[PDB]
Coordinates of N, CA and C and ligand atoms in Angstrom, one line a residue:
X1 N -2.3 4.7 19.2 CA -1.1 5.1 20.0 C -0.5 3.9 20.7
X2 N 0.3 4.2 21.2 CA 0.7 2.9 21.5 C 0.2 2.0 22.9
X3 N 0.0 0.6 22.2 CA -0.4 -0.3 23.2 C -2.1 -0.1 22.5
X4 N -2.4 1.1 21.7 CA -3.9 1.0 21.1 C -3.6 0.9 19.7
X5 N -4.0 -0.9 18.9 CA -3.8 -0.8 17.6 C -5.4 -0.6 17.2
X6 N -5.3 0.3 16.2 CA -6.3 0.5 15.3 C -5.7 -1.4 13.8
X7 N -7.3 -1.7 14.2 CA -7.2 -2.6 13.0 C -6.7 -2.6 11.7
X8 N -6.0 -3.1 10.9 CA -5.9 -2.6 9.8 C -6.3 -3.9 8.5
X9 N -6.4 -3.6 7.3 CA -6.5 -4.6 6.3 C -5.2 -5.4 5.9
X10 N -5.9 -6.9 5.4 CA -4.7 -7.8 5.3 C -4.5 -7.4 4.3
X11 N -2.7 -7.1 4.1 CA -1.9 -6.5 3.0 C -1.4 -7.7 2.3
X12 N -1.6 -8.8 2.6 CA -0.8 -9.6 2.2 C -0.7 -10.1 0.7
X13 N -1.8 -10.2 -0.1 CA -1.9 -10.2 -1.7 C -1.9 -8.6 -2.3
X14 N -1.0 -7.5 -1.8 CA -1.0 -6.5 -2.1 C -0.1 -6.6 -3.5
X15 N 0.8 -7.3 -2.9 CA 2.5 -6.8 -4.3 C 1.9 -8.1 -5.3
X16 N 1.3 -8.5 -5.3 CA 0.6 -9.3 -6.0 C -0.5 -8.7 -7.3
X17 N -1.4 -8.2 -6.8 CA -2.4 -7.2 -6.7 C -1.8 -6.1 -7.6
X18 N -0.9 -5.4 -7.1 CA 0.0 -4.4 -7.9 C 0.6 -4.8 -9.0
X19 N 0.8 -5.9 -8.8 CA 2.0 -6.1 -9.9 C 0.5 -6.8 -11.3
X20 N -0.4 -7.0 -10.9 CA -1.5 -7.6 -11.4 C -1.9 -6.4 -12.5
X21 N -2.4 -5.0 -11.7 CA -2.9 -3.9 -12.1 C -1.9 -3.3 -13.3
X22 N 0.0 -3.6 -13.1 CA 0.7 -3.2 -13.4 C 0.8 -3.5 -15.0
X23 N 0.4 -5.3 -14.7 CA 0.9 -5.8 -15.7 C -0.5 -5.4 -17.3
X24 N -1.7 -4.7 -16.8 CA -3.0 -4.4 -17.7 C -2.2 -3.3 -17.6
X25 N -2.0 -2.5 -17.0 CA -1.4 -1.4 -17.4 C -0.4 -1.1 -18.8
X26 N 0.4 -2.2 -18.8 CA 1.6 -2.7 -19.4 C 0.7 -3.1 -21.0
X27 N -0.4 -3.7 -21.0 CA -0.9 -4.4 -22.0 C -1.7 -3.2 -22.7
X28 N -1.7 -2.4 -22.2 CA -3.1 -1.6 -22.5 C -2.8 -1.1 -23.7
X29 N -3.6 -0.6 -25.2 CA -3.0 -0.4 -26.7 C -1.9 1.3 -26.4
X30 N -2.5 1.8 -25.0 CA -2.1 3.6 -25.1 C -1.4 3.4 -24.2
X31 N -0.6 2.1 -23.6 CA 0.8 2.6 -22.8 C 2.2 2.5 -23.1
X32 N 2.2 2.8 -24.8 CA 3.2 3.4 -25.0 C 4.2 4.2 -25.3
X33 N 3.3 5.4 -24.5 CA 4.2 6.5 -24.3 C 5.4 6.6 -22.9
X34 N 4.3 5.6 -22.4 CA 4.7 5.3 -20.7 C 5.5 3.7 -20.0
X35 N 6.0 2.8 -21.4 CA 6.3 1.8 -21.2 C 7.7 1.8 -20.2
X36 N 8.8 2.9 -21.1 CA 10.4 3.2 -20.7 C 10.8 4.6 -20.1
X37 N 11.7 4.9 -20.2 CA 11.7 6.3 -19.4 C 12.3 7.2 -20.6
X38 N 11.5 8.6 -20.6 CA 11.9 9.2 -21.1 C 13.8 9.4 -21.6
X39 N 13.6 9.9 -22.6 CA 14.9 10.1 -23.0 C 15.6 11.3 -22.8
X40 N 15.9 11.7 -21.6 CA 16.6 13.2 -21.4 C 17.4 13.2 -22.2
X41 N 18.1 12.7 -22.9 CA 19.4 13.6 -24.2 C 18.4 13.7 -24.8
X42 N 17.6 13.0 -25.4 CA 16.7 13.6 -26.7 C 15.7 14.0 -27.2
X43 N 15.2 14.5 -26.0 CA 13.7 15.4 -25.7 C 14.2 16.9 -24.5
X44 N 14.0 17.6 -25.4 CA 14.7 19.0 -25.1 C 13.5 19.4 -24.1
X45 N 14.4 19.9 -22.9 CA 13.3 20.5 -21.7 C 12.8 19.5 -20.8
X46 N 13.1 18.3 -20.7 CA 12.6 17.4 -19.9 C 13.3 17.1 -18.4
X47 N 14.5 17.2 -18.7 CA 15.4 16.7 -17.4 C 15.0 17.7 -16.3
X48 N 15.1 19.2 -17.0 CA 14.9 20.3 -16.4 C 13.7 20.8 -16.0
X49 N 12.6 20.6 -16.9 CA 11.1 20.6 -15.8 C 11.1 19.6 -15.4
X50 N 10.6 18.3 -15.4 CA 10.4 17.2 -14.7 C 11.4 16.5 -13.9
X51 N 10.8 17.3 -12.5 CA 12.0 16.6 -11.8 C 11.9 15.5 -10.8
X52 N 10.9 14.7 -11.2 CA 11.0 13.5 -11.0 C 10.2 12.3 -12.5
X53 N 11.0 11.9 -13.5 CA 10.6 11.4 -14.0 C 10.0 9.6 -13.6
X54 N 9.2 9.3 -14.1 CA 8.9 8.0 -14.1 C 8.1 7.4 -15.0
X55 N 7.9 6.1 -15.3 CA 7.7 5.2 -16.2 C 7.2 3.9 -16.0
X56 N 6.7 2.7 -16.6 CA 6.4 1.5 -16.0 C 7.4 1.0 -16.0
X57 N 8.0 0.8 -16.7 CA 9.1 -0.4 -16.4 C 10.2 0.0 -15.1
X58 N 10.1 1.3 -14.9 CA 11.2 1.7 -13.8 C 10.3 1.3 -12.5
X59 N 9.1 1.5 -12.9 CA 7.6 0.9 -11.4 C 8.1 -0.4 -11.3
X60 N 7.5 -1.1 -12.4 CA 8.2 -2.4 -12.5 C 9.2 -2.7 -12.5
X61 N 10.2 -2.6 -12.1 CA 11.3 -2.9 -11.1 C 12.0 -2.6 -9.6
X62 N 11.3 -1.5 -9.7 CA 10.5 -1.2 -8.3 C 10.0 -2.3 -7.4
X63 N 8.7 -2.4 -8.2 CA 8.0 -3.7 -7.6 C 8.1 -5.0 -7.2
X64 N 9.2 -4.9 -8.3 CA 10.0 -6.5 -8.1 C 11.2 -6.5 -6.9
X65 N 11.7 -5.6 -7.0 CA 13.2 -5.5 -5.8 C 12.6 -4.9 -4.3
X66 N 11.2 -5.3 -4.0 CA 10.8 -4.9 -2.8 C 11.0 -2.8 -2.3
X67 N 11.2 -2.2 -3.3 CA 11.3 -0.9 -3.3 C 10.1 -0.2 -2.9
X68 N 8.9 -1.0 -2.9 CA 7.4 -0.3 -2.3 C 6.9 -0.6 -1.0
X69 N 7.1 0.5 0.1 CA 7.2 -0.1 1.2 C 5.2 -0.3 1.5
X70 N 4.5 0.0 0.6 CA 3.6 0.0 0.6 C 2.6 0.0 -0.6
X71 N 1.5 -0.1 -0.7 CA 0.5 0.0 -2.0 C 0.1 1.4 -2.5
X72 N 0.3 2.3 -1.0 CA 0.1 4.1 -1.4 C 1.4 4.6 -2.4
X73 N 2.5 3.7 -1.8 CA 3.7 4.4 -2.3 C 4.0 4.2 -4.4
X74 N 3.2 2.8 -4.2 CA 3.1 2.4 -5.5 C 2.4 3.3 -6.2
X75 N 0.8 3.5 -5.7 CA -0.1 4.2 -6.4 C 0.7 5.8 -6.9
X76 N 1.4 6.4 -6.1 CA 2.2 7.7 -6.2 C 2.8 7.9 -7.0
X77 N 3.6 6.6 -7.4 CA 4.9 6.5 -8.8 C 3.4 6.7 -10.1
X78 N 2.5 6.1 -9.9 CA 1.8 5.6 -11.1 C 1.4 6.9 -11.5
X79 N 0.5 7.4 -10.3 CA 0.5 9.2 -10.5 C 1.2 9.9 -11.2
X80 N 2.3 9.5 -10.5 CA 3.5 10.5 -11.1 C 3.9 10.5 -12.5
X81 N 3.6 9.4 -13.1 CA 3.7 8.9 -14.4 C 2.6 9.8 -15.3
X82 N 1.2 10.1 -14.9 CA 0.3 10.6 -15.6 C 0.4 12.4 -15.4
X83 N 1.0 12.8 -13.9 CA 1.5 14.5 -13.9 C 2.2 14.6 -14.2
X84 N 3.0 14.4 -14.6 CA 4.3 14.4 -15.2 C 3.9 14.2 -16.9
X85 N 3.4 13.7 -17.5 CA 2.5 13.4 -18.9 C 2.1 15.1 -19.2
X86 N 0.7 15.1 -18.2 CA 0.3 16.4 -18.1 C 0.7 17.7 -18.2
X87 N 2.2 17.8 -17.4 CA 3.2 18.8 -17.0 C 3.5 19.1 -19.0
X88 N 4.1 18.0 -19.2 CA 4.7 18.4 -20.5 C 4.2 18.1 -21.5
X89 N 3.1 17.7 -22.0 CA 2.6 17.5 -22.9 C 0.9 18.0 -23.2
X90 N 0.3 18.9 -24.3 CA -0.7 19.4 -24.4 C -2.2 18.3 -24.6
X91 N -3.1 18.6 -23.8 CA -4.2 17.7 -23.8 C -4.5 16.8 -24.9
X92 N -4.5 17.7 -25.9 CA -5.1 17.8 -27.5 C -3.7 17.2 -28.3
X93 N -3.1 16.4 -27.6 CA -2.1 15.5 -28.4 C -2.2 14.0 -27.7
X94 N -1.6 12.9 -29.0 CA -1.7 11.7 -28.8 C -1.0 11.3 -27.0
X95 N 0.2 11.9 -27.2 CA 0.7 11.3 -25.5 C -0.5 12.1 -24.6
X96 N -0.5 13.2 -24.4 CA -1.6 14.0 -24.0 C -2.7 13.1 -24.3
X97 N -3.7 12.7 -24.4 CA -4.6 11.9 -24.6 C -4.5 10.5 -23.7
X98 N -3.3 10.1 -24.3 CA -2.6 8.8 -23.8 C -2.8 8.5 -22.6
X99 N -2.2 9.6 -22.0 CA -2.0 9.8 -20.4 C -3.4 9.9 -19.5
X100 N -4.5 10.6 -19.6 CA -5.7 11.1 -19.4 C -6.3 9.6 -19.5
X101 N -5.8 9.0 -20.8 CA -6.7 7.4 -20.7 C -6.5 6.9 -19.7
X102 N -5.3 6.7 -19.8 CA -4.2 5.6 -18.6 C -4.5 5.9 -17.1
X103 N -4.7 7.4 -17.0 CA -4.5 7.7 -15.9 C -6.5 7.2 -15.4
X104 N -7.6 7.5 -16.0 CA -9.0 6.6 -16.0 C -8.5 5.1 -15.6
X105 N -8.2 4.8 -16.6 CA -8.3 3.2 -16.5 C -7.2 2.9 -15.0
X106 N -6.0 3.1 -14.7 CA -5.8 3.0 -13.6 C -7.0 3.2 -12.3
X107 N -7.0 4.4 -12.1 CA -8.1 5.1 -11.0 C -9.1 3.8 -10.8
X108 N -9.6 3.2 -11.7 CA -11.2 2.6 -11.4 C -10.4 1.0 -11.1
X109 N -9.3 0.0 -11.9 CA -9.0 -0.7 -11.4 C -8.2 -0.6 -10.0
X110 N -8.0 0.7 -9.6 CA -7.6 0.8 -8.1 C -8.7 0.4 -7.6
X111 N -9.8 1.8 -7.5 CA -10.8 1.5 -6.5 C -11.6 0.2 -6.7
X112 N -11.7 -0.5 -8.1 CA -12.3 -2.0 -8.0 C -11.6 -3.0 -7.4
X113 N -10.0 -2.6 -6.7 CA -9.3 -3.8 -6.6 C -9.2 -3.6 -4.8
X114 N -9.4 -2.6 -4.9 CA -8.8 -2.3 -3.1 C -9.7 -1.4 -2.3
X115 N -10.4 -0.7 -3.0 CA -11.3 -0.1 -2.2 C -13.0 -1.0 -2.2
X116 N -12.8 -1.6 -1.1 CA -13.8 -3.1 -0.8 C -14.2 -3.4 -2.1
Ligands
6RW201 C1 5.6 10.2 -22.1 C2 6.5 11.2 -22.9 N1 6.4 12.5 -22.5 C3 7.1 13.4 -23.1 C4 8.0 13.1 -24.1 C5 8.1 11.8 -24.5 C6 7.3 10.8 -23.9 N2 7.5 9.5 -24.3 C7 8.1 9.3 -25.6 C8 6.9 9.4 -26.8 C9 6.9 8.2 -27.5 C10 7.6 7.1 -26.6 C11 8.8 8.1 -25.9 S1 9.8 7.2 -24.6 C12 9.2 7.5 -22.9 O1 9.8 5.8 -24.9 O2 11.2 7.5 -24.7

């Protein structure tokens, strides 16, 4: 409260860090289903259930124009990228699969990168 700071961790190689996790993400052989943003003209049903679409490259530029007021807000788009997968696509298909990888291999380079 105020005038009582609870300590907090140095954030300072965060957008670093992120953009680090971003760029394996980017490399990985199954991210690309999730490189660009969907195509609402030409994937029928998309605009209209998914109502927040997202993508890496739209993260990644995010990341770069200071748009992440934080490392949680980052991790949320990244989420959002694999529920959104989920939402519209069946397990037992390539993007379906894709996403379930991605969304593993993120998860563990989070908690190996930031959680001590
Ligand atoms: C992630 C997703 N979910 C539902 C429909 C389509 C997609 N991705 C497409 C599949 C191949 C690449 C395109 S894309 C995103 O490059 O236009």
């Amino acid at each position: 409260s105020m005038s009582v700071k609870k300590p907090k961790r140095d954030d300072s190689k965060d957008l670093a860090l992120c953009s680090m996790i971003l760029t394996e993400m980017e490399t990985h052989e199954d991210a690309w289903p999730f490189l660009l943003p969907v195509n609402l003209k030409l994937v029928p049903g998309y605009k209209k259930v998914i109502k927040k679409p997202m993508d890496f490259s739209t993260i990644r530029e995010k990341l770069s124009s200071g748009q992440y007021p934080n490392l949680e807000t980052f991790a949320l788009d990244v989420r959002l990228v694999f529920d959104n997968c989920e939402t519209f696509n069946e397990d037992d298909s390539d993007i379906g699969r894709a996403g379930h990888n991605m969304r593993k291999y993120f998860e563990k380079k989070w908690t190996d990168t930031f959680k001590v």
